[PDB]
Amino acid sequence: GFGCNGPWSEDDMKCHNHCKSIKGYKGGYCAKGGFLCKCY
Amino acid sequence: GFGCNGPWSEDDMKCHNHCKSIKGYKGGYCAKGGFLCKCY
Amino acid sequence: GFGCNGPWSEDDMKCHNHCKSIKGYKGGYCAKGGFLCKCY
Amino acid sequence: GFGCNGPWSEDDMKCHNHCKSIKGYKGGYCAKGGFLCKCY
Amino acid sequence: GFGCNGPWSEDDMKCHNHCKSIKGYKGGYCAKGGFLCKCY
Amino acid sequence: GFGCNGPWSEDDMKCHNHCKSIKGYKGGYCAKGGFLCKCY
Amino acid sequence: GFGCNGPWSEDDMKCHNHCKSIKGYKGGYCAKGGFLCKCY
Amino acid sequence: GFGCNGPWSEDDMKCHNHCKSIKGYKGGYCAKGGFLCKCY
Amino acid sequence: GFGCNGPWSEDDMKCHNHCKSIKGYKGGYCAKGGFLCKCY
Amino acid sequence: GFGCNGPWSEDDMKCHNHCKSIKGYKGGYCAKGGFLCKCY
Amino acid sequence: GFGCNGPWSEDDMKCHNHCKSIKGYKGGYCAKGGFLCKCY
Amino acid sequence: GFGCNGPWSEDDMKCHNHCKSIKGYKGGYCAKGGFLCKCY
Amino acid sequence: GFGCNGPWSEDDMKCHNHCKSIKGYKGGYCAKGGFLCKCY
Amino acid sequence: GFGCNGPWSEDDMKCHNHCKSIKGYKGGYCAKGGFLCKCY
Amino acid sequence: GFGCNGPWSEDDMKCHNHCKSIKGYKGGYCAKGGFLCKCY
Amino acid sequence: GFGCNGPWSEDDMKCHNHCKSIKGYKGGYCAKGGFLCKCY
Amino acid sequence: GFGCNGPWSEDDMKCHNHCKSIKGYKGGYCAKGGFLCKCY
Amino acid sequence: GFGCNGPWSEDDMKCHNHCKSIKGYKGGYCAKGGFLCKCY
Amino acid sequence: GFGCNGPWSEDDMKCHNHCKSIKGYKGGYCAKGGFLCKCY
Amino acid sequence: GFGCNGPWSEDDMKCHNHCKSIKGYKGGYCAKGGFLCKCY
Amino acid sequence: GFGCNGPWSEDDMKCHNHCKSIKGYKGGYCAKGGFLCKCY
Amino acid sequence: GFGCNGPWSEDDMKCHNHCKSIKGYKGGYCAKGGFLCKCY
Amino acid sequence: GFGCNGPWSEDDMKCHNHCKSIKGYKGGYCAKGGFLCKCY
Amino acid sequence: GFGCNGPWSEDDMKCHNHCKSIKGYKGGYCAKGGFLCKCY
Amino acid sequence: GFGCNGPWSEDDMKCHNHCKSIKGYKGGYCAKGGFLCKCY
Amino acid sequence: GFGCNGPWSEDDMKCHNHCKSIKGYKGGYCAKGGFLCKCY
Amino acid sequence: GFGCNGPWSEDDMKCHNHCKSIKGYKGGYCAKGGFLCKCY
Amino acid sequence: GFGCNGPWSEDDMKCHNHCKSIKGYKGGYCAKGGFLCKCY
Amino acid sequence: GFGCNGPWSEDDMKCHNHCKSIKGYKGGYCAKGGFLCKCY
Amino acid sequence: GFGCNGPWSEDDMKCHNHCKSIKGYKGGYCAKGGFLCKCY
Amino acid sequence: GFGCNGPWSEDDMKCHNHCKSIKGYKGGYCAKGGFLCKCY
Amino acid sequence: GFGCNGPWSEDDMKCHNHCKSIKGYKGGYCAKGGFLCKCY
Amino acid sequence: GFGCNGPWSEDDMKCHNHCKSIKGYKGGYCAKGGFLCKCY
Amino acid sequence: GFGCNGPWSEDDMKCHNHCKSIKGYKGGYCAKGGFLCKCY
Amino acid sequence: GFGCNGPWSEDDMKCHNHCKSIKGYKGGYCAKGGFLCKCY
Amino acid sequence: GFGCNGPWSEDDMKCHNHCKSIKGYKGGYCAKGGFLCKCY
Amino acid sequence: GFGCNGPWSEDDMKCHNHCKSIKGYKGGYCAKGGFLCKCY
Amino acid sequence: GFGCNGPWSEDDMKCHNHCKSIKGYKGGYCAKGGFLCKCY
Amino acid sequence: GFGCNGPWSEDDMKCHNHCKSIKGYKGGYCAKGGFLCKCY
Amino acid sequence: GFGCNGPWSEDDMKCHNHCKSIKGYKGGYCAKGGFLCKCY
Amino acid sequence: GFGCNGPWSEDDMKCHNHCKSIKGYKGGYCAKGGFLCKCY
Amino acid sequence: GFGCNGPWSEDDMKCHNHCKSIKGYKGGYCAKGGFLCKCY
C-alpha cells in the first residue's frame, strides 16, 4: 500500500510522505521488492 | 484477494486492515508481485 | 523513491541527480538492494 | 546508476565505459555490493 | 522464460525440468535476479 | 515485446526463439523486470 | 499508447517500431508495468 | 525456487522446510544471492 | 531465513532474536555472506 | 546485524555506536568477515 | 563487469575468457571481493 | 571462477574438478582470499 | 573448502569432521592462511 | 568501520586519514584481518 | 578450529578453554602459524 | 592467545600484562615462535 | 592501505611504488602480517 | 610484493624469478618473515 | 619458495623434490630460518 | 621438515618417529639449528 | 614485547631504546631466540 | 510398494520420488525382480 | 495378506508398516510375485 | 477359499490363520494370482 | 522404469528413446539386471 | 494365449502341447515373463 | 482390450487374431501383466 | 511349464521331479530366466 | 529349485542349507546365472 | 533393447540383424553383461 | 547370440556347431567374455 | 547367498559384513562370477 | 561389492570413493577379475 | 564350450576329460583367457 | 573403470579418451591385468 | 582346471595340493599365463 | 585398446593395422605385457 | 599360488609372508614369470 | 600378433610359419620380450 | 612384490620407497629379471 | 618357439630335444636372451 | 624403473630423458643387466 506497487508504483512519493508524517521516522521506501511501504 | 489485484488494486488499505484485524500482525502487503494479501 | 525501484528502475540517473542537488553530497545510489535512494 | 543494479544488473559494460569517459580513470566497477558505479 | 518471472514466479518446476533435459545438470534456478532460467 | 509482459507473460519461448534467430546469441530473457526481451 | 496496454497489449511491435522511427533510439518497451511506451 | 526469490522472498521458512523434508538435512538457505534453495 | 537476505535484509534483529530464544546461544548473525542465520 | 552486512554495509557507524552505548566497551567492528557486530 | 557480480555471479568464465583474450595474461578472477574482473 | 566466490562460495567441488583435469595436480583451493581457483 | 573460508569460516568443525571421516587421520585445520582444509 | 571491510574495502585511505586526524597517531591500518581500523 | 583463525581469530580463549577441558592439558595455543588449536 | 599471534600480534602488551597479573611471574613473552603466551 | 590487504592484496606494487616516492626509502612491504604498508 | 604474502603466499616463484632477472643474483626468498621479496 | 614458509610450512616435499632435481644433492631443508629452500 | 621447524617446532616426536621408521636408526634430531630432521 | 618478534621484528631499535630508558642498563637485545626483550 | 509391482508396474515415478526424499540418493528402481523400491 | 494382492495391490504401506512393526526389520515387500508380504 | 478371492479378497488374514492352524506351516498366501490359499 | 522391467520389458525402445531425449546421450540400456534405465 | 497368463496360468500344459503339435518344434514355454507362448 | 483382461480373459485368441490382421505382425499377447493387447 | 513361472513359481520341485522321471537326466531347473523347465 | 530363482530369489539360505545337508559338501550357490542350486 | 535382455533374451538374432542393417557393421552382440545391443 | 550368453549360456554347443557349419572354420567359442560367438 | 546374485546383486555389504563376522577374514566378495559369497 | 560386478559393473565410482575414504590410497579398481574392490 | 566359461566355469574337469577322450591328447585347458577348451 | 573391465572391456577407447582429457597425458591403457585405467 | 582360472583363480592351493598328490612332484603352479595347472 | 587385452586379445591384427595406418610406422605390438598398443 | 598370478597379482605380500614363515628364508618372489611363489 | 602373446602364447609355431611364408626369411621369433613376431 | 612384476610393472616407486625405508639404501630395482624388489 | 619363452619357459628340454632331432646338431639353447631356439 | 625393464624395455628414451632432467647429468642407461636406470 501507500503507493508501493512494484512496477505500477506512481511517482507521488506517497510512501515517503506517509512515513515522514509519523513521528520518529525521516522517510520510507518500498521494501519486500517494491510492495511494502516501510519506514526508516 | 483483499484488494491485492496488481495494477487494478485500489488504495483501500483492505489488505492492511484485514491483516491488522488478526491478532499478532502489524499489517499486510500485496506479495506475489501485487496479487496475494500477506500479513506481516 | 527517486527512481530506485529494483529491476523496474528506469535508467535516468534520477537518484544520482537528486542527491547531487542537495548540498554536501557528490552523488547517490540505490541502497537497500536497489530500493532506497541514498546520498553519499 | 550506470547499470549497477545488483542481481538485475545487465552485462552492458555501462559503468566501465562511463568511468573510462572521465580522464584519469582506467575503468569502473559496481561497489557497495553491486549497486554503486565507482571509478578506479 | 521457463517460469522465471521475478515476483510473479510460481514453483512450477519448468526451469528444473528444462535443465534436467540436458546432460550433466542436476537442476535449475532463476538467475539474473529471478528472470533467467540457469542450469546448475 | 516478444512476449515479455511481466505477470501476463506467456511461456511461449518467443523471446528465446527470437534471440536464437540472431547469430551469436544462445537465447534471451525478459529483462527490465520482465518487460524487455534481451538477448544474451 | 503505441500498443502498450498491459495484459491487453498486442504483439504488434508498435512501441518498438515507433521508438526506432525517432533518431537516437535503438528500440522501445512498455515501461510503467506495461502501460507506457518508453524509448531506449 | 522453494521461496528463494531474492527481495520477493517471503519469511515462510519454505526453503528450510523443504530441505528438512529430505531426511538427513538440517535446513536450507537461499544461495546464489538469494535465488537458489540449498540444503545443508 | 530469519531475515538474513543479503542486501535486502531488514534491521529487524530477527536472526538475533531467534538465536537468543534458543538456550545456550548469545545471539546470531547472517553467515554465508549474509544469507544464513547462524547462532553463536 | 547493526549494519554489519559485508559489502552492503552502510557507513552509518551503527555497529560502533551500538557497541559504545553498552557499558564496558569503547567500540565495535564487523567480525566474521564483515557480518557480525562485535564489541571490543 | 564481465560477470563479476558477487553472490549473483554466474560461473560463465566471462572474466577468465576476457582476460585470456588479452596477450600476456593466463586468466582472470573477481577481485574487490567479487565485483571487479582483474587479469593475472 | 570455478565456484571460488569468497563468503558466497559453495562446497561444489568445481575448483577441485577443474584442477583434477590437469596432469600433476591433486586438488584445488580458493586462493586470493577465496576468489581464485588455484591448483595444488 | 570444507568450511575453510578465511574470515567467513564458521566454527562448525566441518574441516575437522571431514578429516576424521577419512580413516587414519586425527583431524584437520585450515592451512594456506585459512583457505585449505588439510588433514593431519 | 572507517573503510576497513576486508575484500570490499574501497581504496580511499579512509582509515589512515581518520587515524591521522586524531592527535597522537601517525596513521592507521585495518587490523583484525582487515576489519578493524586501528591507529598506530 | 576452536577459534584459531590467524588474523581473524577472536580473543575468545576458545582454544585454551577447549584444551583445558581435556584431562592432562594445562591449555592450548594456535600452532601452525595461528591456524591449528594445539593442546599443551 | 593473549595477543601472541605471530605477525598479526598487536602491540597491546597483552601477554606481558596477563603474565604479570599472575602471582610468581614478572612478565611474559610469545614463545613457540610468537604464538604461545608464556610466563617467565 | 596502499594495497596491503592480507590475502586480498593485489600484486599492483602499490606499497612499493608509494614508498619509493618518498625520498630516503628504497621500497616498501606489507608489515603487520600483510596489512600495513611500511617503507624501508 | 612479488608473491611474498606470508601464509597466503603462492609458490609461484615470482620472487625467485624476479630476483634472477637482476644480474648478480642467484635467486630470492621471502624475508621479513615471509612478506618482503629479497634477492640473494 | 618451494614450500619453505616458516610457521606456515607444510611437509609437502617440494623443497626435497626440487633439490633432488639437481645432480649431487640428496635433499633440501628450509634455511634462512625456515624461508629459503636450500639443497644439501 | 618432519616437524623440525625451529621455534615453531612442536613436541610431537615427529622427527624421532620418522627416523625410527627407517629400520636401523635409533632416532633423530633437528640439526642445522633446528630446521633439518637428521637421523642417527 | 618491545619489538622482539622473531622474523617479524621491525628494525626500530625499540628493545634497545626501552632498555636504555631504564636506569642501570646500557642496552637490550632479543633473547629467547628473538622473542624476549632483555636488558643488559 | 511405491509402484514397484512387477508386470503391473506403471511409470508413475513413485519410487523415484520416494528415493529423492532421502539425502544422497539420485533415484530408485524396482529391485527384487520388479517388486521392491530400491534407492541408488 | 497385508495388502499384497498382485495387480490389485493398494499402495497402502501395509506390508511395509507391518514389517517395520517387528523388531529387526527395515521394511517389507510383496514377494511371490506380489502376493506374499515378506519382511527384509 | 479361505478368503482368497482376487480383487474382492478381504484383509481378514483368513488364509494365513488357516495355514498356521496346520502343523508344519508358518503361514499362507493367495497363490494362483490371488485365488488359491496355499500354505508355506 | 522407462520400460526396463526385466522379463516383462517390451521391445518398444522406451529406455533408449528416453535417454536420447536428454541432449548429450547416445542411448540407454536396462542396467541392474534389466530393471534400471541407464543412459550412456 | 495358449494358457500363458502369468500367475493365472493353468497347469494344462496347453502351450507345450500346442507347440509340439506344430512340425519342427519339440516344445514351448511362456516367454515375455509368462504371457507369450513361444515354441522352441 | 481385445480380450486381455487378466484372470478374466477368455482363450478367444482375440488379441492374437487382431494382431495378425495388421500387416507386419506375427501375433499378439497380453502385456502389462495381462491387460494390454500388444502386437509382436 | 512344469512349475517354471518366474516369480509365481510354487516351490514344489515340480520341474526337478519331472526331469528326474525321464531316463538319462538327474534333475532340472528353470532356464530362460525362470520360465522353461530344462533337464540336465 | 531350493530358492535359486534369479532376481526373485529370497535370502533364505535354502540352497546353502540343502547343500550342507548332503555329506561331503561345504555349501552351495546358485549357478547357471542364479537359477540352479549347485553344491560345492 | 533389440532383444538384449540377459537371461530372458530370445535367440531372435534381433540385435545381430539390427546391427547388420547399419552400414559398416558385421554384426552385434549383447554387451554390458547381456543387456546392451552393441554393433561391431 | 548362438548360445553365447555369459552365465546363462546353455551347454548345447550351439556356437561351436554353428561355426563348424561355416566353411573354413573348425570351431567357435564365446569371445567378448562369453557373449559373442566367434569362429576360429 | 548373502546378496551375491550376479546382475541382480544389491550393494548391501551382506557378503562383506557376513565375512567380517567370522574371525580371521578382512571381508568378502562375490566369487564364481558374482554368485558365491567368498571370504578373503 | 562397491560396484565391482564383473560384466555388470557400472562406472559409478563407488570403489574409488570407498578407497579414497582410507588414508594413503589414491583410488580403487575391481580386482579378482572384476569382482572385488581393491585399493591402490 | 566344454565348460570353459571364464568366471562362471563349473569346476567339473569337463574340458580336461573331453580332451583326454580324444586320442593323441593327455589333457586340456581353457585357453583364450578361460573361454576356449584347448587340448594339449 | 573407464571401460577397463578385462574380457568385458569394449573397444570404445574410453580409457584412452579419459586419459587424454586430462591435459598433459598422451593416452591410457588398462593396467592391473585389464582392470585399471592408467594414464601415461 | 584345479583352480587355475587366471584373474578369477581362488587362493585355495588346489593346483599345488593336486600336484603334491602325484608321486614325484614337489608342487604345482598355474602355467600358460595362469590357466593350466602344471606340476613341477 | 586396439585389441591389446592380454590373454583375451584376439588375433585381429587391430593394433598392427592401426599402427600401420599412421605414417612412419611399420607396425605395432602389445607392450606393457600385452595391454598397450604401441607402434614401432 | 600365494598371490603370484602374473598381471592379476595383488601386492598382498602373501608370497613374501609365506616364505618368511619358513625358517631359513628371507623372503619370496613370483618366479616363472610371475606365476610361482619361490622362496629365497 | 601371430601368436606372440607372452605367457599366453600358444605352441602353434604361428610366428615361425608366418615368417617362413615371407620370401627372404628362414624363421621368426617373439621379440620385444615375447610380444612381437619378428622375422630373421 | 612391491610392484616388480616383469612386463606388467608400473613406475609406481613402491620398490624405491620400500628400500628407502631401510637404513643405508638409496633405492631399489627389480632384480631376478624384473620380479624381485632388490635394494641398492 | 620350441619352448623358448623367456621367464615363462616350461622346463621341458623342448628346444634341446628339437635340436638333437635334426642331424648335424648335438643340442640347442634359447638364444636372443631366451626367446629363440638355436641349435649348436 | 624409468623404462629400464629388460626385454620389455621400450625405445622411448625414458631413462635417458629422466637422467637429463637432473641438472648436471648427460644421460642414462639401463644398468644391472637392463633393469636399473643409472645416470651418467
Give a written overview of the molecule:
It is classed as antimicrobial protein. Keywords: fibril, helical, antimicrobial protein. 42 copies of one chain form a homo-oligomer. Chain A has one domain. Chain A has 2 helices and 2 strands. Chain A is globular. Chain A starts with 13 loop residues before the first helix and ends with a strand. A two-stranded antiparallel sheet of chain A has the order 1-2. Chain A is an alpha+beta fold and 40 residues long. At the D-K interface, strand 1 and helix 2 of D face loops of K.
In short:
42 copies of one chain form a homo-oligomer. Chain A is α+β, with helices and mostly antiparallel strands.
Helix content of chain A: 25-40%
The percent range for strand residues of chain A is 15-25%
Shape of chain A: globular
Largest sheet composition of chain A = 2 strands, antiparallel
Q: Topology as H/E string of chain A?
A: HEHE
Q: What strand order characterises the main sheet of chain A?
A: 1-2
Distance between the termini of chain A: 16 Å
Q: How many structural domains can be distinguished in the coordinates of chain A?
A: 1
**What assembly state would you assign to the polypeptide chains in this entry?**
homo-oligomer of 42 chains
Q: What count of helical segments of chain A does DSSP give?
A: 2
Measured on Cα atoms, how large is the radius of gyration of chain A?
9 Å
| Strand element count of chain A | 2
